[PDB]
Design a protein around this ligand. Structure first.
Ligand SMILES: [Zn+2]
Lengths: 324, 129, 122, 70, 225
RNA sequence: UGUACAACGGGGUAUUGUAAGCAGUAGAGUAGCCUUGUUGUUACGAUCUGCUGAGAUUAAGCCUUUGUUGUCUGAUUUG
RNA sequence: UGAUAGAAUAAUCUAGCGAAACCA
């Protein structure tokens, strides 16, 4: 392949997994921001391997997961020339993150982005509800418009990212009504992704050669960590009350007070990068897919140097008191 | 399983530190390559002031406590009792609290005597003139 | 940790002093690289000093001590005090009755007879 | 005690920095305003070829600068 | 009329205190001499600035401390072939210490004061003889030319008097043998005048040492000891 | 004109390994002084001990900031 | 009186001057 640079730093999802209309209406991908890498102790459950029922130490990558919010939908009708959106539907109240995304000079603009669109709910909704019933009627496939809570993130960019997600639940009408309830509300990955899920990662890699869109597939999610948990770094074996945040935090990133996904292996791109987490394009059954992993211990030490503790309470407990 | 550093006494973890094994099958774990290269040069941790051979040999901290009677490697295993588990958890948390309290109060003995010797030494800078 | 042309110790009681590896069995084929032996590897090795009956003849030998820090599956980086191997048949059945010094855990897991003649594991 | 007597000399040189700054400020003001007035009155009006004008301006500016200096 | 600032020597780049002086001199000078994004200087390059610098810069500044004696030195240079002037420091002052000694609302931070500073010579020279040595008078006149020619030339009726913000003064008493460089940010009292001053950055004092060639240690032109 | 930005400051994390300076009976010994010693003590004494994981660095591409302080603007283009 | 200047340190650019070969 000719190595030309990426178009956008938010990499495109060129293909989505297959629509099952017998499952409830649910998302198919997510956009998070990778914090960094650490090392996880767990037990291997692999008969046929000599390392069966044996402690393995594994490199993982953790992506910060702010809860994503839906602000619009887009229905595509089939043409003999390809997919084409007949329209897009927006919600009324959109944040300055998203109105910032449309603008290049937000700091001096009069911020006039979706003003007259807000007059479209000043009415009963007749044009808007006509459009919703149109996307019920036409537009065989449905994509939803989502953006992240980037202010809840140590990113210096206050401008959140918008993306489309193909909605592979059932019933296009129930899909657009589902999105209609889910306008301006939130969706966490706990209703979308789960433990042991084989996911694919779509991300622009590290420029220096580089800065190319890459899709690395078949990565087992190891932890769907909740933001309210203070035992994010804990296990049933590791009974410390500690977070997933490293000692000193993630290097050049900040922290994760939000939800997070800890996934096996490595991933294209660097830290501070927008990464799409897509579920698998097929039902992998490789027994590397079916594995219900069970963690044991989480490294949360410093990568800012050769770390030697996990909690600072452990640090004071070993070092005792100081002169300071 | 947590082991100590051979050179720091610091807790060694998976992925952390290098082990050396002599011909007499004695494993020595080091939390970092500073400890490991310090062992390579045949050095004494009683010479290096920061490591706990010097600090437990020196008297900066207390080194024997009645709280230390609980932490010991036991070669005879015990059958599983679920009801002892949470009691051991409460024991570990409580005893670590008591250990930090005794260590800080042991350091509280150190700072009072400098008042007395500063009194006795500033009397010498007054009473001669 | 040992490429082609490496002197290693002799931990069995056969009578050889040192084992000079001249070939590594089961190594890859890449240009300008060297076939590198490690723990749990049967390589062709020649005896330099000891009994002359074991000298001037290559023997297969399994390496029990490596002295280069490897990554074990559980999280530890570890290495022996020296390089050492024990000579045996290609069938893996030992020549020496008792193998002195520490024997690697992966190597004793690999060969049942080496573990049958292992005194010290790790 | 002594450091305040040092601060006396430091505020003294501060006011020394103040005086010449106010002087050169009012000097550049006076020279620019006077030369703009004198060129706007007669000097720009007559020949207007601007080969001659610029020399007259620089002469008037150097003259008023020499007057406000010494 | 661009300018450089560098600390020369292992002892200089070893000192974190002298880095503060480097930062503050970078904050004092004009936008044309704003060397900014040259904070990270290298261990490898030693008088390597003279090869790439005179493509686009003049008037280099050197910091150096002797390995034997505990004194640090300024040198003032030209990147074309000229003179250098060697100085010992006196009473190095941290600008953060001038913060804590006296709190003043400073405009070093904002980009509104992205403007060149000005020239005040507090009796640095005497055109009169005043003594038996006229070479000292020549020293005074040459260094006057130095400070009026490091900064951009200001034919004053051409100069726009809107930008005043940075001002700079060199205090030379003849009896002390001491030259002191103290600069202030200006404030305007609009009375048709009256002008306030506030301290901004580092306050110093220097001592004349020697005059060499503009390439350092090339030709020692004048001794003064 | 704002959870706004920035210079400081603070806290966190990591690096190096006990800073300067104070005290000593610790110091192989040499003279010195008598109260010729059952450690009598006073001077020099590389070093050692306590103050002291002390002191130094810490983002220049680490993290955080209810603390301080200042800031917010011009040039061009389109129906 | 003699020599393309200017800048790059007194080791590439601008400026100035400015060909010929050949040409169903
Ligand atoms: Zn250690």
């Amino acid at each position: 392949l000719p190595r030309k640079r990426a178009a956008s730093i938010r990499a495109r999802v060129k293909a989505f997994p297959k629509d099952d209309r017998s499952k409830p209406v649910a998302l198919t991908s997510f956009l998070g921001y990778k914090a960094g890498m650490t090392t996880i102790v767990r037990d291997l459950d692999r008969p046929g391997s000599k390392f069966h029922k044996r402690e393995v130490v594994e490199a993982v990558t953790v992506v910060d997961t702010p809860p994503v919010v839906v602000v619009g939908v887009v229905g595509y009708v089939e043409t003999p020339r390809g997919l084409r959106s007949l329209t897009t539907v927006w919600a009324e109240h959109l944040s300055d993150e998203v109105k910032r995304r449309f603008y290049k000079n937000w700091y001096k603009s009069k911020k006039k982005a979706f003003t007259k669109y807000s007059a479209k709910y000043a009415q009963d909704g007749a044009g808007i509800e006509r459009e919703l019933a149109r996307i019920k009627k036409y537009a065989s496939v449905v994509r939803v418009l989502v953006h992240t809570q980037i202010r809840k993130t140590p990113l210096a960019q206050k401008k959140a990212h918008l993306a489309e997600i193909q909605l592979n639940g059932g019933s296009i009408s129930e899909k657009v009504d589902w999105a209609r309830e889910h306008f301006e509300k939130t969706v966490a990955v706990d209703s979308v992704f789960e433990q042991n899920e084989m996911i694919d990662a779509i991300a622009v890699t590290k420029g220096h050669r580089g800065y190319h869109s890459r899709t690395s597939i078949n990565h087992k999610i190891y932890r769907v960590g909740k933001g309210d948990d203070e035992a994010n770094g804990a296990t049933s074996f590791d009974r410390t009350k500690k977070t997933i945040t490293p000692m000193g935090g993630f290097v050049h990133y900040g922290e994760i007070k939000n939800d997070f996904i800890m996934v096996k292996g490595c991933i294209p791109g660097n830290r501070k990068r927008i990464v799409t987490l897509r579920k698998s394009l097929y039902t992998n059954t490789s027994r590397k897919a079916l594995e219900e992993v069970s963690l044991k211990w989480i490294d949360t030490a410093s990568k800012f140097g050769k770390g030697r503790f996990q909690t600072p309470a452990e640090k004071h407990a070993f070092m005792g008191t100081l002169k300071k | 399983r947590i082991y100590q550093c051979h050179f720091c006494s610091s807790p060694c973890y998976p992925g952390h530190g290098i082990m050396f094994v002599r011909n007499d099958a004695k494993e020595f774990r080091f939390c970092r390559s500073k400890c490991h290269k310090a062992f390579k040069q045949r050095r004494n941790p009683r010479k290096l002031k920061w490591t706990k051979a010097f600090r437990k040999a020196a008297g900066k901290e207390l080194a024997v406590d009645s709280t230390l009677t609980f932490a010991q490697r036991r070669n005879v295993p015990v059958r599983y009792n679920r009801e002892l588990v949470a009691t051991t958890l409460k024991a570990m948390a409580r005893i670590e609290e008591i250990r930090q309290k005794r260590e800080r109060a042991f350091y509280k003995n150190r700072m009072r005597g400098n008042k007395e010797k500063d009194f006795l030494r500033d009397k010498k800078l007054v009473e001669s003139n | 940790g040992l490429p082609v042309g490496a002197i290693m110790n002799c931990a069995d009681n056969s009578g050889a002093r040192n084992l000079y590896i001249i070939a590594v069995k089961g190594s890859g084929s890449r240009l300008n690289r060297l076939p590198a032996a490690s723990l749990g590897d049967m390589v062709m090795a020649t005896v330099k000093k000891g009994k002359p009956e074991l000298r001037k003849k290559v023997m297969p030998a399994i390496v029990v001590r490596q002295a280069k820090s490897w990554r074990r599956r559980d999280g530890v980086f570890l290495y022996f005090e020296d390089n050492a191997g024990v000579i045996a048949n290609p069938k893996g059945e030992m020549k020496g009755s008792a193998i002195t010094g520490p024997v690697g855990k992966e190597c004793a897991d690999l060969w049942p007879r080496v573990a049958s003649n292992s005194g010290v594991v790790v | 005690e002594n450091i305040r007597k040092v601060l006396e000399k430091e505020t003294a040189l501060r006011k020394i920095a103040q005086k010449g700054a106010v002087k050169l400020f009012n000097a550049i003001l006076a020279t620019q305003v006077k030369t703009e007035k004198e060129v706007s009155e007669n000097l720009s009006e007559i020949k207007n070829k601007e080969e001659k004008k610029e020399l007259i301006t620089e002469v008037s500016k150097e003259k008023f600068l020499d007057l406000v200096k010494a | 009329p661009k300018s450089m600032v560098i600390r020369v020597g292992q002892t200089s780049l070893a000192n974190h205190s002298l880095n503060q002086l480097v930062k503050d001199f970078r904050q004092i000078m004009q936008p044309h001499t704003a060397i900014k994004l040259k904070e990270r200087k290298s261990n490898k390059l030693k008088d390597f600035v003279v090869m790439c610098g005179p493509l686009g810069v003049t008037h280099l500044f050197m910091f150096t401390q002797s390995e034997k004696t505990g004194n640090v030195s300024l040198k003032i240079a030209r990147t074309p072939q000229g003179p250098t002037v060697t100085f010992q420091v006196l009473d190095y002052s941290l600008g953060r210490d001038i913060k804590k000694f006296l709190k003043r609302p400073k405009s070093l931070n904002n980009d509104d004061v992205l403007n060149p500073p000005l020239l005040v010579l507090n009796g640095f020279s005497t055109s009169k003889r005043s003594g038996e040595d006229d070479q000292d008078v020549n020293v005074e006149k040459v260094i006057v030319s130095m400070f009026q020619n490091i900064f951009p030339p200001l034919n004053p009726a051409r100069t726009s008097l809107n930008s005043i913000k940075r001002v700079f003064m060199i205090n030379k008493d003849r009896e002390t043998g001491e030259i002191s460089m103290r600069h202030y940010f200006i404030d305007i009292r609009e009375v048709e005048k009256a002008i306030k001053l506030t301290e901004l950055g580092p306050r110093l004092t220097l001592k004349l040492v020697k005059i060499e060639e503009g390439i350092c240690s090339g030709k020692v032109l004048h001794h003064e000891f």
